[PDB]
């Protein structure tokens, strides 16, 4: 329904895709319905924790990130639909912090890791099963276009490589009408 503000809570799992690991964290959305079908959502999560490895070296590094995302949405159906799927599009902001190499990587002549903040596009496919006037069950799949820079020191020498990451976010949540 229009003018409605609700909040979902549940699991948010991020899978890098462009060797980096996956991590599942608490995910909160704060959606506001503009019309009966247009919504404006904000994704927010607890900081993720990804282990980083490559080929022979293995888990050499570890980075944390926060990927808030702002989305314009379209909910299919009408205001009396208990099953409303939705598609979303909008920008992502990703910030990295507590980058640190481990014992394995620090013996490889590796120091000072820092990924630069990234902005990019984000796509969205979700589904709201509305249980009643207040409760709902939700699934959403996110595709974000992430472009950071990897800065590190190889044996004291500055390294600087740009990557594309394009991770998938899978949220299984449960919302409430506020």
Author numbering: 35 to 52, 65 to 224
Q: What does the report in the manuscript say about this coordinate set?
A:
From a clinical perspective, OMPs are important in modulating the diffusion of antibiotics into the bacterial cell, where mutations or reduced expression of the OMPs enhance antibiotic resistance. In addition to its role in conjugation, OmpW contributes to virulence as the upregulation of OmpWEC increases resistance to host immune defence.
Here, we present the crystal structure of OmpWKP at 3.2 Å resolution and draw structural comparisons with OmpWEC, both of which are conjugation receptors for TraNα. Continuous electron density could be observed for most of the structure except for Gly41–Phe52, which were omitted from model building. The OmpWKP structure consists of eight antiparallel β-strands (β1–β8) that arrange to form a hollow β-barrel in the OM and an extracellular solvent-exposed region. The extracellular region is formed from the extended β-strands of the barrel and a single α-helical turn (α1) connecting β5 and β6. The extracellular loop 1 that connects β1 and β2 is missing in both the OmpWKP and the OmpWEC structures, suggesting a highly flexible structure. In the OmpWEC structure an LDAO molecule is bound at the extracellular region but loop 1 is not fully resolved, suggesting that the inherited flexibility cannot be stabilized upon its binding. This highly mobile structural element on the extracellular loop is likely to shield the hydrophobic face of the extracellular region and it could transiently open to recruit hydrophobic substrates.
